């Protein structure tokens, strides 16, 4: 004997939200009785034909129908069937006419919810967009829920773009770097999915309001300058200074073309390297946090070498 021919006339008998019952006509067995049928599916969201699970778990050679299980709601599927005997597995059937599974409400929650930062008086929330095949119906979107820490009433923002990964709430009553409880869910035309777990997200900061003081520069060589300054006083974990930004430009160059060195943390000293000898540089220092830079120090000048 030889491997079986293709089965024919794959037909979708019934389709639900997660199953599809198929029928087919047997092809030639080529003198070795058919011992199994296997089904594969194709969708617009994955490359190529893929194995699927069935009831019964193994489709015997005397079965001309079976139910494909664990499909995703509101997805367009093609199916095809392969016949096997003791000799081998035959060529796949021609595919069934495309059919969409029924829709349901979203089941997953948006993954990897986070947030923070942003511009003045904003609250920035982020998440991983839900993959298309898990959206379960048309009209898919996100429900972003939030409330200032210590309050009861929730606010809900809808984000009707299935591709979106961020929502920015802007309101002037948000004090800087204020804690919010946040949770994110999905919805579609069939209804709402569940919210994920509640997490704490901080609103945007405000730029530091003080310039640093005591900016001094000392020439160490033809190319290196030691810059030191005094930290801003009274910075806290709530009104933060993350580091400082040094800007430096050569005399008779524009301030707009300045080089930039940033520190992170508490050390208010840095060496600027790579300079030209016997050359005068202007330097300023500013504090920064995630909202941006504060006012600059006065300009200090230093001549190398």
Residue numbers in the entry: 598 to 902
Give the published text.
Introducing the T751A and V752A mutations in chicken CNTN4 reduced its affinity for APP by fourfold, so we found it intriguing that these changes occur naturally in zebrafish CNTN4. Finally, complex formation does not involve any substantial structural change in CNTN4, since the structure of the unbound FN2 domain in CNTN4 matches those of amyloid-bound CNTN4 closely.
Instead, they form coreceptor complexes with distinct transmembrane proteins to transmit signals inside the cell. Finally, structural analyses of five CNTN–amyloid pairs indicate that these proteins interact through a conserved interface involving the second fibronectin type III repeat of CNTNs and the copper-binding domain of amyloid proteins.
